[PDB]
Each structure stands twice: as structure tokens, then as C-alpha cells.
Amino acid sequence: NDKVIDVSDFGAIKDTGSDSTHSLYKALQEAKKIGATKITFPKGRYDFYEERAADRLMYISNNDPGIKRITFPLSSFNNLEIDGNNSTFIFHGGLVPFILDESSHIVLRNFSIDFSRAFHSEALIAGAGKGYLDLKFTDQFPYKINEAGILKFQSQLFQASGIKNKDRLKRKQISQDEYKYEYKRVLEFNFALREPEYMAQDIFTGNALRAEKLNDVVRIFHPNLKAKVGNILVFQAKHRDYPGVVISDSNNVELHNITIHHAGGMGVIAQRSHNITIKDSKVSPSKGRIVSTTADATHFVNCTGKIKLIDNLFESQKDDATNIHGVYAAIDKIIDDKTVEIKLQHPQQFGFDFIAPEDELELVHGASLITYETNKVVTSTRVSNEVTRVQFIKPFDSRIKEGDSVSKVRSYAEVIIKGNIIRKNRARGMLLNSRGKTLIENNYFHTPGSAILFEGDANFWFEQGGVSDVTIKNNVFENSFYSQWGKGIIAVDAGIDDKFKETSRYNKNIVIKGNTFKVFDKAPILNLFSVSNLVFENNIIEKTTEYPERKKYNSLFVINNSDNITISINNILQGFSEGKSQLLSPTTTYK
Amino acid sequence: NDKVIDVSDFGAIKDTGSDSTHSLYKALQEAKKIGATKITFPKGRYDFYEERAADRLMYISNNDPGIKRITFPLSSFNNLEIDGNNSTFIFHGGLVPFILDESSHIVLRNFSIDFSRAFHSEALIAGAGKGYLDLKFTDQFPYKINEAGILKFQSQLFQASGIKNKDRLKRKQISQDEYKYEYKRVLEFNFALREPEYMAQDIFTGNALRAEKLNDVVRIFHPNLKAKVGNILVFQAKHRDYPGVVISDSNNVELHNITIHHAGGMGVIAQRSHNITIKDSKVSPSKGRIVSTTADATHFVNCTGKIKLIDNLFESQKDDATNIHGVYAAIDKIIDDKTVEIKLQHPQQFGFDFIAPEDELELVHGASLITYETNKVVTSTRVSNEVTRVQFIKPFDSRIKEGDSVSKVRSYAEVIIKGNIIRKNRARGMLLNSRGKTLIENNYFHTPGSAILFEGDANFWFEQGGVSDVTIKNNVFENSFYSQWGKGIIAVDAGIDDKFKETSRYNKNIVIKGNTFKVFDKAPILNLFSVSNLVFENNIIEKTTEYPERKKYNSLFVINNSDNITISINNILQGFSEGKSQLLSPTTTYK
Ligand SMILES: OC[C@H]1O[C@@H](O)[C@H](O)[C@@H](O)[C@H]1O
Ligand SMILES: OC[C@H]1O[C@@H](O)[C@H](O)[C@@H](O)[C@H]1O
Ligand SMILES: OC[C@H]1O[C@H](O)[C@H](O)[C@@H](O)[C@H]1O
Ligand SMILES: OC[C@H]1O[C@H](O)[C@H](O)[C@@H](O)[C@H]1O
Ligand SMILES: [Cl-]
Ligand SMILES: [Cl-]
Ligand code: NI
Ligand code: NI
């Protein structure tokens, strides 16, 4: 039809293991040429390789920039639905499955994304001693130990060809693939619960560990290795070069019933885009794996309109389930009374262009995150993937210094996050850096880090946060924040120096009602600073014994430098040995 | 003036160490806007950094592709001379100094190029034992040994700031710079002669060596380490990301009195360009260094017109002094009787586009390098940075198989290489893969590898060679080919399988006259196969004792599968103990 295009008409045949990339490409161009509104896959398994994938330079915020090979290069597509009919997609090597670029009204529906060799690696811990672990790898994680004695994971094990010359080039190719499987650090996971081991920490290794094949078993050596035998050691991928679904300068995108088993980086990363829905989808590992995506499950940078995460499962990724936030760029040079040069600060922010004439920017004091003023841009001149020269309509506030920051005033995204399951990932649940109206309703949280974190800073990540209207209602937080890294189940960790906490009110107007908190010890349920107007009422708090109690904590409510904080008497806490009046009484310390 | 632009008028001030990149940029744009023909630097030292350099995707043949930061982004410039007045240019970090792209009539004159921290590293060998070397590094080569026990070179040593937060970002930045200084292998250099140690070999390490700080001295561990104490160990840079001068799709470019002290990769790399002169220039290390560029000094891919290398010094680079050659692309898929898909084979060839309609291509048998036919292109469709679909005007020769190759029929460059000094580099002198008229006159060669190599192959490098008109006259070859890797002083090593050597005549019409060969043993002066019509006459051959004699060789002239080879009786050989009649008598073996 000129309305519905079947990829098989273009040569893509399921269930054979052959490369479907070019057939898919021609089907895409025909859909655009005639204006078809849907591309369908006959249900089956489709494999995509590097050799015939479109190449484009990409800057992708909070991931690694470079030349990308892209299986679905959805540049300037409009009103196009891709229905996989529950096909499974397998990506071989360094591929970005989807990049939506200047596209509009795109629907992705009914398929799964996976890579044939994960970018992270995993092993069974078979033994442990001072300065070493003994590991067992499955076939799924090929590796070599070279003559230098260094463990190096591989894209695949070299199978000889017959033709001697095809072998020399294939070895060189496998050898250059090593970069993609570089590791950075290791983390112990509980075998039975399939989550980071209780009170285990990241152990920084670098990308080279000393190793020996005992002579089936691999011993790795590092002074700081420690782990329980029988658990699973995860090698964290060093790079974020292959995110799953990139949504960039696009609008009205919907993901329905998408399963992202794996990504080199984040599963879904959206930048400078408007209206995004992710519904009935899954971030969850494929067979034999305890880890899903090697970074965040979802992530939104300078997005507008409505961001909806509805009835999804987000489990087992190496970072947060979501983060919705803006970009700060530091004021690097003051040119004249009207003109500055801003510089993107974090490496995975380089190439993020966002300042244009007529834009309004916040001018922000760095150590306090307090806004001096807003000012309109009349000139924006991109000098590099770091520096942009900005001239304002009027001279900027005379208190502004080099080292302060700007962020664009936006129609901040309205956030609706409901019905999701968030568990077994490594870090936090949700970073709520959304200044727009935010609703967190009917989610389940079981996270090692904070289930919900208000962050943002203008000194390292350079991420704009600061909420103005948040409702967290009818959620279950079950034994969340069980790790050693974090400040509470629901916490503020904005980059506000101690000396400015008393005057900065970065997060405002938060309602926390009707939730159930199942907690195993007395770590903070709320750990707040620089908040104005928060009401915590009609919650149920219920003591458990899921994990050993951490003696470091003896306060459910840590409040500093805030105003209008109501920890209502109408909350219910049962199963604690202390009195209700003590348990609801805020402290300034963990105590 | 509107004719001559002084960079200092645009804010570039010598001898201060500040970044001159943006001032230079505005001077470049003004020169293009008004049509000025020259930009001058007041003599001094100018430093260029990453932060404000223009970023562009680049595919650069025989080097590494990616996003490049470019100090002199000479895109679409015409009739422009850059005169440095013997200024010195210092490049900090990952910068490509010059990229000439679609430019015309460009003159670069009177300056030097260097990087503040070399991409390779060097050390004094202070001790040696089984499976280890003991090294001493100077300040110029900063490094860390991390807790894993791995030696990792650094862009710089971290100097604390005062402000604690500027320190955290700077550490992250220094940490991400580590990739640029990765090593691959080590090679021992003779301290006194400043050249690869006699009969030393590359020792493959990989990018991670075990190491210990003895407690000023660094011990590295690897089973295959062996070296003489007092020599200098060079760590070969793993990447070729920052070549010195890129000349791409450009014409009529001249380099006069340019000193390239260092490059991350090749000093000068030219691709698909027409008429290039390099005169009175130097590739030669800066103070404290024994290595110059980390790959070839110069290199020309699919160039046309005249290539002139006149009165230059090319010393101490890690590869060849020059290589002038074409590209083969393998026939990966046969589509129909008229249509194939070609695929670039070597990773550093990806993104090399060269086939367009109306082009004539050679269709070549892979194992023999014999041309089946030429055929004209009517359709070229780039699928990726690897694959292009090519359709011919007529059905191609029915003997063609997948695995054969194509190369474009070109106005092959006329090559004039005269008055150059070639010495102390690691590999060969000149790879003469130039099918156009070639003149090698009045050069001095002192190379560890072959001084002059006819190479090319369609199985690994995929480089088109095959000479048709070569004159090698009045050169001095002094103790060249003193290493264990090579086949002779002047040798053929084309990728022609043994079974086709008898029928393939890939190199034709070579005159070798009036040269002086000073040789220390009886390795081949000529080692030829698949040559037709070569005359070796009026040469002087003179025995020396510069290096120990290699007992493996007892033949100055090894000839196989050739025709019309004249080793004239009018050559002079003095200082040998064998008879003249034996010494000029060809063999089929080293004997
Ligand atoms: O799960 C138990 C294990 O937990 C880790 O955090 C600890 O470092 C190991 O020594 C072992 O105690
Ligand atoms: O230069 C002398 C040295 O040369 C190297 O090629 C050899 O491996 C060392 O053991 C030492 O003999
Ligand atoms: O703390 C913010 C931080 O959170 C996660 O780690 C993300 O992966 C990062 O990109 C960054 O957004
Ligand atoms: O043998 C050919 C080979 O020669 C040198 O090593 C060059 O650095 C390579 O790019 C390649 O051209
Ligand atoms: Cl202030
Ligand atoms: Cl043949
Ligand atoms: Ni937002
Ligand atoms: Ni040529």
C-alpha cells in the first residue's frame, strides 16, 4: 500500500540472521517519498550489522559523542509509525538502534532491542581472597588475557575462516572492537535478589585489570576487590557510545510496548524535544544477564510539553530510571557589559547547542543556584562544541562573575510518571529536576540509592533542576535506599554550598501523600535542605527486617534550611520500637 | 591591508602562552570575506588549545576518523598564503593543526608545529632482566601507575587549583585525556645513533603494561621485553587521531620551510588532491625527543598532478618517509551482471569516497593484482562509510569474483622526490606505489627497513601500486635496511600470491643508475619479483662494517618471476672478498 509499507517487500526476511539494515533503509526512504504512515515487520527476529548502516556525527547529551552508525536513521520523518509486531531486533557491534532527529509524530510499537554481545560483562564469583577474585564467565562474555596479563573483553571469539587472508583482517577487526567492551569499575550483585549486593560499593578498577587463567576460572587482581562468593560481579562499561533510542530536536514521539534489553549507555535519551510518551514498555535484561542498559533507563534534557512514563517496567540498569532536567552552561569569559562566552562544562554535554536570539536565559549564581535575573539573547555565536558567545539586550546584572552559569528559560516539561515498577537498578530511582508541573503517582520503588532525588548543580554535572510543583502520591517505596551511597529515600542533593543553604530555596511546593514506605531501618524518609513549602501527610510507614539495620541512622526526617515543612501528625507508623512523637520529629543530623 | 592580514590585529599576541585560536579564526574569516591573499604572524610563539577550536567530522585516509578539533580549518579557501615568519606553533591536546578541505592555491610558509605533550612516550632504559625493563622518564612524559598496577600516560600532571571544585572537573578532564596517550608496542632505540637499535624488533604490548615504581625508576613487566641498558625505549602511540597537515579534495598546495616536530599520526596526509609541493621543510623531533611524528612523515592517497618533495629532511618518524598510492576497494557483493557493492576493507580507509559516475575503474583479480578490464561507472550510491553500490555501463568481465577489487583510473601523480635526507625513522624510506612518471634523484637514505619498497596489495592494506616509469638516479643509500624486517635495500613486496608471480608483471620500466650503495653485509640490494624491464647500471657499491654482518644473506641481487632484468657489468663493487662475477650474479634465494 501507499499507506502501510511491509519491510519484507524490500528484502528484509525474518529469522535468518542476515543483515536487514539496507532493506530497512530503502523501505524508510519509500515511506518518506510517498507519505506512508506506517512500516510493519512480519513477526520474527531481525539482525542488523555495522557494514551498511548510515553514518552521522552526533552530539547526544549525557552520552558520548562521535560518528554513529544508525540502524533506524529517522531524520526529518513525520507521521510515521514503526510496528514490529513483537519482532525481536538484534544489533551486532557498535550501532545506535534509533536516532530521531528533527522528526515529528513518530510512533515506535511492539518490538525488542538487544545487542548480540553486551557492552558490559558479568561473571560468577567462585572465589575471593585478599586482593583478588576468582571468576567464571559464560560464553556470552568472551574475553582474552593477553601476554601482558591484562583481561580484555572481546566482541566475539575468533573463529578461523579457512581462507588465511580473511583471517588476518577479521583479527584486526575483532582487535579494534576491544574499545567498545572496555570496563571502568566492578560492582557485586546479590545472586538471589538480582540487585546490587546490600552495602556493596562501586570498586574503581580502570580499564585494565591484571588477570590469570588458573591452570575454566579467571583470577583478577586489584587491592580493593572484595565480594561474597556466589554473587555476580558486573564490569561496568566505560563508554556510552550506543544508546537505544535517541530523540533529538523532535516532537510528539510515543513508545508503546518497546522492550529495551540493552544499550551502550542509556535506553532512551531525549534532548531538546517536545511531548514524549513511553507506555507499557520494559527496560529489563535478556537471558543470562543481570544488567539491562549500561546507563540510565530514560533521560530527558531541555524537553518541553508533556513527558509521560506510564505503566512501564524499568529494572536492572546501571543508573537512574529517569532524570528530567535542563542544562547550565558556565560563564567562562565576560566580554563587555552585555556579552559573555558560555562554555559547556561536562564532556558529555559538549556539542549541546541551545542558546539562540530571542531566548530568555536565567543568570544564576553558581554556589547558591539563586537566579540574579533573566535576560534576553540578541546574539548567539557558536565558536566550538564547547564555547558560545552570547550578547544580551541589556547589560547583565553587575553581580555576575565568571564561574556563574546560565540556563534557558523554557516551557518546562509537564511530568506524569504513573504505574511504573522501578527496581534492581544500581543507582537512584528518579531525579526530579523538573521545574514544570510534576506528578509521581502509583509507582513501585525498590532502589539501592534514593528512590527520588532532587539534584541539579552548577559545579560538576551542570544540570538545571529546582522544582516548583510536585505531587508524589499513592506510591509504594519498598526497602528503597538500602545502599551506602545516598542521603535518604526521598532526598535533596542540589549543589548548594553550606553557606548559601539558608538563603537559597531551589525546590518549592511539594506534596507527599498517600504513599506507603516499607523501611528496614531508620534512614531518612525525607532528607531536605533549601526547600520551601512541603507537606508530608496521610502516609503509611511500616517497619521491616529486609536488610540489616544501619546503626548510622536514627531519624526518618532530616530537615535543614527550609521553611513551611509540615510533617503531619496524621501519618501512620507501625512496627517501630520508638514513640510516634519521636519518629515524626525532624532532626538536623542523621543522629 | 585588504591584501595582507596580520593576526595580531585580531588579538593574537605572541610569546604569552594564551590561546590564539579564536583570534586566528576571525582573521581567517576576514581574509576570506575581503579576498586577502596572505595572513602573517609576527615572529614568536603561539599556543592553541581545544576549547575554542572548530569541530568537524573528518575521514582521513590511513589515519583515524572522528570528530576533529581544527586550529586552521581551511575549508574552501583560495589563493591564501599563511606566513609564520618562523614563529613556533604549540598545540595543546587533541588538535589537528591544519585541515585543507576543498581549498585551492594554499601556501604554508615559515613555521613549526609541535604538541606540548607528545602522543608517544620515551624512557631511558636503566635496567633489564627476564620479563621486565627498568625505565626513567623525564618530565616531558607524565604518567601514573593506578591501583590496578597499570602504567598510563597522562596529558599533564594534575596541579591543584585552590578552588576545590575546579579541581574535580580538571581531574575528570585529565582522566579522559588518557585515551590520547595510549600505547600499543615498544621499540628499543640506539642511544648514540638516535635510531632503532640494530636488529631490534617491535615488541607488542597492548595498551596496558603492568608496572611498579621501585621504592624515581619505573619497572614494567612483559614476557617479551628485551633491550640493552642505556638505550631509549619508545612507546608507540596507539592512535592516529591528530595528523599535522591534512590536504583533502584540494589542489595546488605548497609547504615551504615548515617544521613538523610531532603529530598524532602522520605529519602530512594528502587524499584526492592535485599538485602538492613540500620544499625545504623538516620532519624532525623537538628537544628531549628521539621520535618525530608517530606515523609516516608524508603520505598521498589518490592524488593527481605533480607531487614534489624537494630538499626536505624527514627523520625519526615511526613509519615511512613517503608513500604515494591509490585505493583498492573489494567487490563485496555481486548484484547483477552490471552491478556490485564495493566495501572499504581497512578501518583507516572507511569513509574514503572516490567512485562517481563517468569514472573509469580497474577490475582487478585479488591474488594476482592483474587487471581483468576497465569499465565505466554510471551509478554510484554510497550506502555507508564502508559500502558503495556501483553500476557499470556494460556487464563486467565474467571472471570477476566477490573478493576481487576495484581501483579508480586516475591521472596518476607525477612524482619528483629530490634532495631529501631520509634517516633515523623506524620503517621504510619510500613506498613507491606511484603508477605515474616517478623520479627519485639525489636523496640520502639511512633506513632500518627497505629504503625503497614497491608494495601494494588487495588483501590487507588494499593499496593500489604498480609502477610504470621510475628513475632512481644519483642517490646515496648508506647502510640502509639494517633491521630484521624487510626483503632488501630496494625491494618488491606486492601482494601477489606465489602461484601468480610468474604471470603478473605489476611493476614495469625501472632505471636504477648512478647511485652509491654503502652496504655492511650481503643482504639484497635488489629483491625483485613480478617486474618487467629493469636496468641496474653505473652504480657504485661499497662494502662497510657499520653493523655486524647478518649470516642469513649472501646475495646482493635476488630475482624471481621477472623479465628483462639487466644487472650490468658496468657496476663497480669494491671492498668485498668475493669475485665481481659472483657478486653481480642474481639468485632466487637469500642463500
Ligand atoms: O554480601 C557480603 C559481602 O558484601 C560485600 O559488601 C563485602 O565487601 C564482602 O566482604 C562480603 O562481606
Ligand atoms: O643492542 C643490544 C640489545 O639488542 C636487542 O635487540 C636485544 O634484544 C637485547 O638483548 C640486547 O642484546
Ligand atoms: O547526577 C546526574 C547524573 O546521573 C546519572 O549518573 C546519569 O547517568 C548522568 O548522565 C548524570 O545525569
Ligand atoms: O604498508 C603500507 C602501510 O605503511 C605504513 O605503515 C602506513 O603507516 C600505513 O598507513 C600503510 O600505508
Ligand atoms: Cl547571591
Ligand atoms: Cl587471472
Ligand atoms: Ni524540564
Ligand atoms: Ni598516484
Residue numbers in the entry:
A (entry chain A), B (entry chain A): 24 to 238, 241 to 616
Give the original sentences from the paper that presented this experimental model.
Here we focus on a GH110 enzyme (PdGH110B) from the carrageenolytic marine bacterium Pseudoalteromonas distincta U2A. Overall, the results are consistent with PdGH110B representing the founding member of a GH110 subfamily that exo-hydrolytically processes terminal α-linked galactose residues in λ-carrageenan while providing general insight into the specificity of the family as a whole.
An initial preliminary structure of PdGH110B was determined by single-wavelength anomalous dispersion using a cadmium derivative. This initial model was used to solve the structure of PdGH110B in complex with a d-galactose monosaccharide to 2.35 Å resolution. The crystal structure of PdGH110B in complex with d-galactose revealed two chains in the asymmetric unit. Residues 25–238/241–616 for one molecule and residues 21–182/186–238/241–616 for the second molecule were modeled, with the missing residues residing in loop regions. The crystallographic dimers have a total molecular interface, determined by PISA (Proteins, Interfaces, Structures and Assemblies) analysis, of 2300 Å2, predicting a stable dimeric state. The expected molecular mass of the PdGH110B monomer is 67.9 kDa, resulting in an expected molecular mass of 135 kDa for a dimer. This indicates that PdGH110B adopts a dimeric quaternary structure, which is most likely the biologically relevant assembly. The α-helix of domain II from the adjacent monomer folds over and along the wall of the active site, which was identified by a bound d-galactose, with several amino acid side chains protruding into the cleft that contains the active site pocket.
